[PDB]
Every structure is written in C-alpha cells, then in structure tokens.
RNA sequence: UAACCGUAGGGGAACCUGCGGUUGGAUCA
RNA sequence: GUAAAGCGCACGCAGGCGGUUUGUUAAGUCAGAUGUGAAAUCCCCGGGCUCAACCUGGGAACUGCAUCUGAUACUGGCAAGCUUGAGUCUCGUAGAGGGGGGUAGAAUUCCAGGUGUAGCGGUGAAAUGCGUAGAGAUCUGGAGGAAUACCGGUGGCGAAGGCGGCCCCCUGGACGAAGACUGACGCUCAGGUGCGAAAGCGUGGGGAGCAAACAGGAUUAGAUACCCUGGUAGUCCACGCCGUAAACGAUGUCGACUUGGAGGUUGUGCCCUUGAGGCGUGGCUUCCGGAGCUAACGCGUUAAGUCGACCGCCUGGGGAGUAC
C-alpha cells in the first residue's frame, strides 16, 4: 500500500488464495522479494519474478495441494504503531512448528527455526501456516 | 479560477527554467494571486461560503507548500517569501 | 481462442455483489464473466472429479432445468452415474432413508411390464399403475441406481437446484456447481463461473464432466 | 480500541459496590435492636416474616432479619447483625445473629444445630 | 387523526396543534 | 447497520503513521561480554528432623538498568536521487454548488367598475360564515406577495445541512485526455477554527397563500382534539444570535486486494463513423447477487468480505442525557 507496503503482500497472497487466483501481481521492494524468496524454499510458492529496471512489478505463483489451496494461513504482526522485536529464545512457532514465521535478522531475512538455528533475533515479520 | 495570460504568465517568473508550471517556487506563488485576488471577492458577498472553503484548500495546500521548501533547501524559502510579500 | 468462447456473459444488472472476482467487466447491459479466472476453475474441479472417479464413488448432476433436462442424460446416464433432471424430491440427501423406500415400488413397478406379469388386473388398473411410472421413473428413475449417498455432487445452475446443494453441504457431500451472476456461490465449494444458461455451454461443459469421469477410474 | 487510544485513556476499573451499610470490613456488628417488626413480603410470596431495625455500634442503623422457627427478641435486647441480605424483605439486608449477645436461639431445632440456636440436644 | 425526532405554542392528564426531517409506515394509496 | 456504541460536516496545529533506490550512520533492534539486580520467598536437583509441615547446599531465575565490542535485514537520522502517491500547467465536459442583481409567465387574495340575481361556501351530514347595503358566477383594469407546472428521472451538484423558472455579474469543486512540470511536498487528526434543516430570538422591513395561539360552528358520554369558518406570531428580506434533528446509509476518513448480471448519468479513443447506432477505456450512481462475513435480517468490488493507518465511541435496565 501507500503506509504498509509489506502487509499489503500478504494481503494480495492471500486474497489470491481465496479466490483460487494462478498468480498475484503488485510493486515490488527489497524486502517484498526478499520475503518471497522465503516462502519459495519453504515450498510455500511455486515460483516468482519481476518486471521492470525502474518500474518494478512483483510475480509471484499461488500454490495449492487438492481441493483447497496450500498458504491457508496468513497473517501479519510486526505492523506499525505496534512493532515486534523478538530475541533468540522469544522466537515464536506457527503451528506448533509445521508453519513458519518470517523474521528479519542481522543477516538478512529468515524463518523461526531459520534465525534460531543461527542462535540470533530480528523483527518478527509475519505468520505462514 | 484564473486568466492563462496571467497563469502562463507568472509561471515564467518564479520557475528556475522553462515552462516549469510545476516547481514549487511556481505553483506556490501561483496560488497568493488567485488568493489575493480573492480576497477582494470574498469582501463582498461574505455569505458565499462554498467559495471560501477552496480559498482555504489553495491557502493551507499552499501552506504545505512553504513547509516543504523549508526542508528542501533552507534559502529557497526566505529567498520567495519576500518576492510575493508573504508572512504578512 | 477454444471452446470456453460461449459462456462469455449471462444475467444481466441483476448480478449478486458476491460474484464480482470473476466478472471479466460489465459491459453492453449484462456483465462478462472473466474466463482468465475460470481457467483454473476449468480443471482444478474436474481434476477432483477425476481423481475421485477413481476411487469407484458417485456422482449426481442436478438440471432440473428445461434446457438441461433432456439434455444431461447422455453425459450422466450413458456415463453410468447419477442425475436428477427434474423436481428435486424433498430429502433425497437428507431424509433418504424413507425416500429411497419410493425407489422400491418404482423398481417392481418397472419387473411389471418386464413380463407377463403385466397383463394383471383390469386393462384400465394397469393404467392407473402405470402412470406412477411416469412420475417415479422421472423423478427418481435416474437415481435408483444410488444404493446410498454419493460421494460428490455436481449441479448444473447453482440457483435453481437450490435445495439441491443445501441438502448437500448438511451431509458433507462436496458440490461442484456452475455457478452464474446472479447466483450465490458460497453454497458451491467448487465454484465454476460460467453462463448457467446458453444450450450450447450446458452442453458442452456438462458433456465435458462426464468425460474426465469416464476414464476417472482408468 | 488502539495502542494510542488506550496509553491515552487505558482500560477503567469499577468500583465494586458492596451492598453493606454495615461495612467496616467485619463478619458482624453489634446493635441495640429499635424494635420488632412482622413486615410482609414482596408480590410473589406471603406471610408475614420477622425483622427490626438495629443501632449498630458505629450508629449506622438498619433493619435486620430474625430467621428462626421462634423469635425472641425485645425493643432493647442487644443482637449482633451478620449479613446475607432477604429477597422477600426489601431494605432489609441484614439478619441477627442466632445464639450471640443478649439475643435467643431456635428452640427445639435438631436439625443445622450450627444455624440457629441450639448446641447438641437432650441426647 | 400513521408514528417518532427536533423546535414552538397550548391544555386536567396522558397529550393537541404548527414547521422541518426520518421509515424504525399498513393497503396497489 | 438494527443489540450499548461513527462526533451533524469540514479544515487543520500538536501527536501517530509513511512510496521506491543507493550510500552512510548505528539510535531503536539483535549477538557476545562486564557490572548490578541483597538475603529470604518461587522453581529444579539433593540433603536433616522416624514422615510431613519445617530446616537446608548448589543452581535456576530475578523477564530490568547501565557499559563495552560487534551485526546492519527491518525502523529511525543524514546525503543524493527516482516516479507510480500527492500536486501544478494546458484544453475540454456536465452540473438545482455558492453569493449578488435583474426579469417572465401561470395562479391566489385584495381594490375599483360592468353584466347579472338568490344563492354561495362547507361537511358524512350540518352549522358558524358570506349574500337583496347585491354575494357567488362572469368580464375589464389595478395593487401585492410567495413559489416557479410541464421538462423531472430509479437524474444531477454539494463535506454536511442542502440546492429547481429565464438572464447577467463574482466565485468553488468534480471529471476526462494527449500530454508537459514538481518530486513523497502524503494519510489521519485530541484540542482549535469554521460551516449547521426547521422551530426559536433581537433590530428594522414586508406580509398573497398557509398557519402554533386564540374565537366561533360541529362531533362526542365528555372533545381544552381530529372536521368546518376565521385567524396572530411565524413562514419572506436584511443583518446579528441559537447550534439541535430519526442532522440516517441509524454504516468515520484514507489506501490496496477479491466471481458476476442488468441499468442510469457524464468524458474520451476507436469502427464501411454509412445508423438509432457497434467495440472498448475513465468518473459518479441504481437494482439483483457468488465466495465470504453475519445472531438473524441481511451486506456483498459504492462490502457489513480480506487487510493496513489514524481518529471518535460502547461496557445491564430504570433513575438520567437528569441533578450539581
């Protein structure tokens, strides 16, 4: 969006799901793909892209098993007027461990057990289940 | 609202180049006349009110103008608010 | 460019605020339905019918529909399954149990004419016996070879075999109906956006679930 | 409502009214006894019940009830108030003590000999 | 005498009347 | 939304929040470490009183504050930018948007005069009332005030309240399109300022119709009403005040997503533009309705669905939006 340009991310993904979309679109950022790098090793996205050397456009692929669809958990924490900064043994665990959590640490964008396995915290991002 | 030959006319005195209608130094100094030139409008009539309230929008909108070039580049500022008699 | 060139738009103004992902754009009075966004819907259903043809289960199309009647026999009875081309009896999903009881006397009503047995009673009582065949081997004709509740259902317009699917979603039976504008696809756990109308879109998609199911089963 | 509508003006309290002239955070209190009265219940229920109004020792007066199958109380015996308010008998939230002060006690009661007046029988 | 809100005046009492708004009004007005 | 709860609506200071890129900083943040966080409680493991309570060793914890050494993803600061947010310019478009001043035609009432004659008016009936001092009806001339049939619509404009004859003058906003320009200049907003139907208030005007009060007639058991005949404030104007309404979508503003159908209104591109016309692409707006949401009714891309930023508000009924 226009203030929360991340949570809008999920938003869009989610909202994709629902509506049983292929692939969902929007402008993208740093730490846009950065967060959708995760999720693709996490098996969480088929694949994603960009467009554009100055007007860059997020692609990302909606994912579904059977009948219902894979990311059926979405949502944010870390938003605005209300942040989150977790340490290395606050760290939460999205469905008692199946789901992830994106967390941004000092090295760079990670998952619960990702930064834990590092043994450093970050800025809790938002929960994937 | 305003005569061309005015507004096409200002535009090429406060802009730091070339038909510039964008430059805040323009705009923002296009807004005082049709709000000067208001003012005198306004003295009569009084009770039309659905006018004032777009001479409010330009007087603030211009006012969020003269912030910005304050944060922008600190002399810009002082260095148009003389040449329009501002500050009152 | 392919056959989904016949379903573009259906039910004009009249449309239902639910429906919206899936209008590729009003326009010309009535509004069009976004085919880019009923291609997956184009599979991902049939994929499930196909993979639950596998499993040997059963299937019930419901067009009790004028313009769906006559013509969905072919792709359900020549399929060998389950279809409900007329007025949808009040519980058979739910109350069965007693309905199916209706099936009995269709089926030894059917063994009458199927031998001498038939020539009983007055010429005029075979008649008046008769006719419960008319009724039952029509209302249920299609049906009787249902020796319990299916396993999935698939209804035509998701509006008017309304009941239909309610009985349904009560008894954990999946639907996978071709939902429409002015129908209300929260009913429908697979929903498909197309014209629920138009001879030619019944036709060809209805004919077109038969055929994954067919071979569902290898 | 929000973070910032909450560290402004943050979640109130209630200040827990407890229904007890007789307050002073005691299980009982003294009293004086004024009189005796026979008042009827409400609309629901009839017969006339037992109750007086007493003066407590911080002077807060108020109507007790006298429960018990045989009163036996005077317009100055001293009773001692407990609590446990009667729907029957409004305003009257109080009841005296059964076997306390210059009060009696149920007679012939063998039954709940701990209510009441009564400390083990005739054997 | 559709009701109610505002506002005003009036009357044993509910309330009546005027002006504006509302549907939280029945019957095809 | 209807249960208690969206301020009547705007603008906006403080405050909260902030599109995209690179460098930089290292404040937030994260990592390590050093202090300190009294002992005793609590907890874990284990000891002694025959057990337990109890007593007791060591640890764990004390979620905190500070300091030091780092880490630089995200937030923040600084520097230089970028353009899709927001805004400016150009040229068009529609509009009952506002303020001022004109002006027209229909009707009412009244004044005068002509014709003409015993009724008119009113109701369910009636009666009050008006009529032989000539009404009513009719026709001619005149005075005056208020409101603008038809077009008028499920229509349009406005922040809200609200805004309808035609003309001119001063003026605001909305939208489209080729574009050109600025470069995050933005969103929200307690307090604050301003706008607010009608009724009402002050001064001074005006006053046709209508009509609280008031007065007659009728109804009725009564009728301080409904009905009828009259009628004052008021309704109208100026200027100042009052700020309320079921000030209602009973639904705060801003932004991004999410099937469809029929229609309305206004801009623009295009099509043998040969046409009423046909295909798109924006703004605003009706009705139906899917997923979903919902206690149900129902809402449903103009959401009451999925989310994000800021603000207002609710916490049982009565007492009471009352007392002080």
Same mark, same amino acid.
């Given at each position: 969006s226009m203030q929360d340009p991340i949570a809008?991310?999920?938003t869009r993904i989610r909202n994709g799901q629902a509506a049983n979309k292929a692939a969902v679109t929007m402008p993208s950022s740093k730490l846009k793909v950065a967060i959708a790098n995760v999720l693709?090793?996490? @098996?969480? $996205?088929?694949?994603?892209?960009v467009e554009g050397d100055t007007k860059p456009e997020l692609e990302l692929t909606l994912k579904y098993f059977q009948g219902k669809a894979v990311v059926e958990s979405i949502q944010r924490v870390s938003r605005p007027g209300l942040r989150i900064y977790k340490r290395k043994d606050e760290l939460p665990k999205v469905m008692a461990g199946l789901g992830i959590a994106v967390v941004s640490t000092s090295k760079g964008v990670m998952t619960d057990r990702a930064a834990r396995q590092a043994g450093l915290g970050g800025e809790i991002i938002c929960y994937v289940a | 609202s305003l005569s061309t030959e005015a507004t096409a006319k200002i535009v090429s005195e406060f802009g730091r180049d070339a038909n510039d209608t964008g430059s805040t130094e323009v705009q923002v100094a296009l807004l005082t006349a049709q709000i000067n030139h208001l003012q005198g409008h306004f003295a009569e009539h009084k009770k039309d009110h659905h006018s004032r309230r777009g001479l409010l929008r330009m007087v603030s909108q211009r006012r969020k103008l003269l912030d910005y070039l304050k944060r922008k580049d600190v002399a810009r500022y002082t260095r148009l608010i003389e040449r329009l008699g501002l500050r009152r | 460019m392919? =056959?989904?060139?016949?379903?573009?738009?259906?039910?004009?103004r009249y449309w239902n605020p639910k429906m919206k992902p899936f209008i590729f754009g009003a326009r010309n009075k009535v509004h069009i339905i976004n085919l880019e966004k009923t291609v997956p819907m184009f599979n991902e259903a049939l994929a499930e019918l196909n993979k639950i043809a596998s499993r040997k289960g059963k299937i019930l199309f419901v067009g009790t529909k004028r313009a769906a009647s006559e013509a969905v026999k072919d792709a359900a009875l020549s399929c060998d399954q389950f279809f409900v081309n007329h007025r949808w009896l009040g519980g058979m999903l739910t109350n069965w149990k007693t309905v199916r009881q209706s099936i009995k006397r269709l089926k030894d009503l059917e063994t009458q004419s199927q031998d001498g047995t038939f020539d009983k009673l007055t010429k005029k009582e075979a008649l008046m016996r008769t006719r419960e065949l008319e009724k039952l081997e029509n209302s249920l004709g299609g $049906?009787?070879?249902?020796?319990? +509740?299916? *396993?999935?259902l698939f209804v035509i317009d998701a509006d008017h075999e309304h009941i239909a699917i309610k009985e349904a979603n009560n008894l954990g039976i999946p639907v996978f109906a071709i939902v429409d504008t002015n129908s209300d696809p929260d009913g429908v756990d697979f929903v498909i956006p197309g014209n629920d109308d138009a001879i030619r879109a019944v036709t060809?998609? +209805? @004919?077109? %679930?038969?055929?994954?199911? /067919?071979?569902? /089963?290898? | 409502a929000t973070v910032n509508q909450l560290v402004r003006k943050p979640r109130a309290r209630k200040v827990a009214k407890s229904n007890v002239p007789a307050l002073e955070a005691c299980p009982?209190?003294?009293?004086?006894? !004024?009189?005796?009265? !026979? !008042?009827? #219940?409400?609309? #629901?229920?009839?017969?006339?019940? =037992?109750?007086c109004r007493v003066r407590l020792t911080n002077g807060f007066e108020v109507t007790?009830? $006298? @429960?018990?199958?045989?009163?036996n109380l005077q317009e100055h015996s %001293? $009773? +001692?108030? &407990?609590? @446990?308010?009667? =729907? *029957? +008998?409004?305003?009257?939230?109080?009841? !005296? %003590? &059964?076997?306390?002060? *210059?009060?009696?006690?149920?007679?012939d009661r063998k039954q709940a000999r701990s209510k009441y007046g009564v400390k083990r029988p005739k054997a």
């Open positions: 809008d991310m999920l693709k090793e996490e @098996g969480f $996205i088929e694949d994603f892209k | - | 392919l =056959k989904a060139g016949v379903h573009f738009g259906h039910q004009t $049906i009787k070879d249902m020796g319990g +509740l299916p *396993d999935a060809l998609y +209805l @004919g077109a %679930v038969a055929a994954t199911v /067919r071979e569902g /089963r290898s | 009982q209190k003294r009293g004086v006894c !004024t009189r005796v009265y !026979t !008042t009827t #219940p409400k609309k #629901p229920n009839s017969a006339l019940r =037992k109750v007790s009830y $006298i @429960g018990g199958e045989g009163h %001293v $009773i +001692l108030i &407990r609590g @446990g308010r009667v =729907k *029957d +008998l409004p305003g009257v939230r109080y009841h !005296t %003590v &059964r076997g306390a002060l *210059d009060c009696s006690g149920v007679k």
